[PDB]
C-alpha cells in the first residue's frame, strides 16, 4: 500500500498577479515572497512556487 | 366686447370656441454591448479574483 495525494493541488494568484497580468500580461508566482526576499537582502527562497 | 352708438354694427358673436391639436416628435437613441460583456455579467462564476 502506497500514500498519494487525495485532491488536485488547487493553487490560485494573489491581487497582484491579477494587476500585473492586467497592465504587463505577465506574472511571478508567489510574488508575495518575491517582493519580501528580494527587499530583506535575502538571495534564496524554501520552495518553488 | 364694447358698446357702441344707437344704431352702430355691434356684432352678437360671444364666446368663440377653438381647438388645437398635438404635434408629435418621438426621439431615439441606441446603446450597444458585446457577446463577452454579457456572458460575463450573467453567469458569475466560482473562479478567482
Redesign the interface.
Given at each position: 500500500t502506497v500514500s498519494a495525494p487525495a485532491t488536485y493541488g488547487n493553487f490560485?494568484?494573489s491581487?497582484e498577479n491579477?494587476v500585473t497580468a492586467i497592465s504587463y500580461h505577465s506574472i511571478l508566482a508567489d510574488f508575495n515572497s518575491y517582493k519580501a526576499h528580494l527587499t530583506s537582502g535575502q538571495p534564496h527562497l524554501p520552495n518553488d512556487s | 366686447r364694447v358698446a357702441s352708438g344707437a344704431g352702430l354694427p355691434t356684432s352678437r358673436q360671444t364666446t368663440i370656441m377653438v381647438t388645437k391639436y398635438s404635434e408629435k416628435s418621438p426621439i431615439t437613441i441606441p446603446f450597444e454591448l458585446s457577446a463577452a460583456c454579457l456572458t460575463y455579467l450573467r453567469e458569475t462564476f466560482e473562479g478567482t479574483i
Open positions: 490560485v494568484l491581487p491579477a | -
